[PDB]
Amino acid sequence: PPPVRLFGVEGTYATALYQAAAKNSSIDAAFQSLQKVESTVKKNPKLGHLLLNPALSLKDRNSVIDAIVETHKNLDGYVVNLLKVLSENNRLGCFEKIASDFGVLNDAHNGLLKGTVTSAEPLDPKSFKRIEKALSASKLVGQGKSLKLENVVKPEIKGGLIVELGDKTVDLSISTKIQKLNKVLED
């Protein structure tokens, strides 16, 4: 069974898919192809917006799948059997929901963690590396559990940064420090 539980929430699809395609060892292929057919499906404006929309019927949905399997073939036929299942289950809006989850499971099997350096500005390459180094140096990123560290720029945060990974965050931002400082100087 899956090495990690996302506690379903349409992660139940991802889980089922994960173990089935894990024993078929065709999860990387599935994921990439799934991404690829999704990118061009999303970029078909009708049924890249209306695919999300639940306008479509059971019968109309099935005909959408037939168009989708024209868009690519192979690269795990368990995700092709999934397409049918999803149209039948009439959910195709939480399709990318499942895609995201499947990616997490897939890269969990690979043993890769995704962290983030939410910040108010795009930081130095020195900073990027130093944080990536720091995280590996800490046991927080253990070995065989890789790091993709993505610094993001968010305007809502005003100065400083919060590093997050392992559901442990160290938030050394100015916004948060300011919040406590302001509060005590209003109290």
Partner: protein
């Protein structure tokens, strides 16, 4: 006594809007850069110490 105490509270509120002014000074200057850099290296110092 009553007005003296009221004046003391009023002073805190006058200085409260001054704190806001000083916050604006931090967010504009290249203190905005220099002290963010300080947070970055501080985060490095803490996180390596983990």
């Amino acid at each position: 006594v009553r007005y003296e105490a009221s004046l003391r509270q009023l002073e805190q509120r006058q200085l409260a809007k001054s704190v806001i002014s000083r916050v604006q000074s931090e967010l504009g200057n290249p203190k905005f850069q220099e002290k963010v850099l300080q947070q970055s290296i501080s985060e490095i110092e803490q996180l390596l110490s983990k």
